[PDB]
Copies of this chain bind each other. A is one copy, B any other.
Amino acid sequence: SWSLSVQTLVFITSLTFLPAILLMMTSFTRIIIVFGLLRNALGTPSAPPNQVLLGLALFLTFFIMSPVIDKIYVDAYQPFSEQKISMQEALDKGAQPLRAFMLRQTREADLALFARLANSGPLQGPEAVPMRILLPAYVTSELKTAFQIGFTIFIPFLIIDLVIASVLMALGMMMVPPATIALPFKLMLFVLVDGWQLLMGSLAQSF
């Protein structure tokens, strides 16, 4: 254990990187990109405010991190009080669930690329991946996953738009823009199937 004043300095300094922790280490990027792509899908880039989407992504991130938060509480929050383990060793033990999660959600190709970017040859085991190699690989994997989910969301709305345009063309209309007609049908399909709750359920299942 080192000095209390140094501990305060380090704690307040690490408090600054909270957006970095939320974005790079948790899943927040995935939900935020999925929400952005879904908003782009419905054809209305300002229908729900950016604030509301950010808060919804924050709540989803909190739930989906609740198991990792519980593991942190068991391994770090509690034993730091009983003083069986404390300080930097307890900090590393508490960060261990974050690795496990980020190893689970990271693809092998990104980790391989970032290892050969750091000349880390003897990285043989999969539970001893350094943070420098694990973090950007995890972010890239999250970007790929979010884009895939966005395309899957895109498919039904694209189908509806194409169907509306095809019926307009077949009915004889050649000048009517299909977007105006298809927008309320997109909304009625989204509400009627209750798209939002199934979307959140799938995102939670998507881990």
Contacts of A48 in B (CB 8 A): 29, 33, 143
| Contact of B140 with A200 in the complex, beta carbons under 8 Å | yes
| Contact of B180 with A51 in the complex, beta carbons under 8 Å | no
A13 within 8 A of B: no
A204 within 8 A of B: yes
- 8 Å CB contacts to B: which residues of A57-90? 59-60, 62-64, 66-67
| Contact of B175 with A176 in the complex, beta carbons under 8 Å | yes
Give the complex CA separation of A67 and B36 in angstroms.
Answer: 35
One of A3-11, A95-103, A111-119, A121-129 at the interface: A111-119
| Contact of A176 with B161 in the complex, beta carbons under 8 Å | yes
Give the complex CA separation of A7 and B40 in angstroms.
Answer: 43
Question: A152-192 toward B: CB 8 Å interface, digit per residue (1/0)?
Answer: 00110010011001100101111111111101100110110
With most chain B CB atoms within 10 A of its CB, the pick from A33, A52, A178, A200 is A52
The closest CB in chain B to the CB of A133 belongs to B63
Give the complex CA separation of A19 and B54 in angstroms.
Answer: 12
A-B contact pairs, 26 of them (CB 8 A): A19-B51, A20-B51, A23-B51, A24-B51, A36-B46, A37-B44, A40-B183, A47-B150, A52-B139, A52-B143, A59-B135, A63-B114, A63-B117, A63-B118, A67-B119, A113-B201, A117-B200, A143-B196, A147-B187, A147-B191, A154-B184, A155-B184, A158-B184, A161-B181, A169-B173, A177-B177
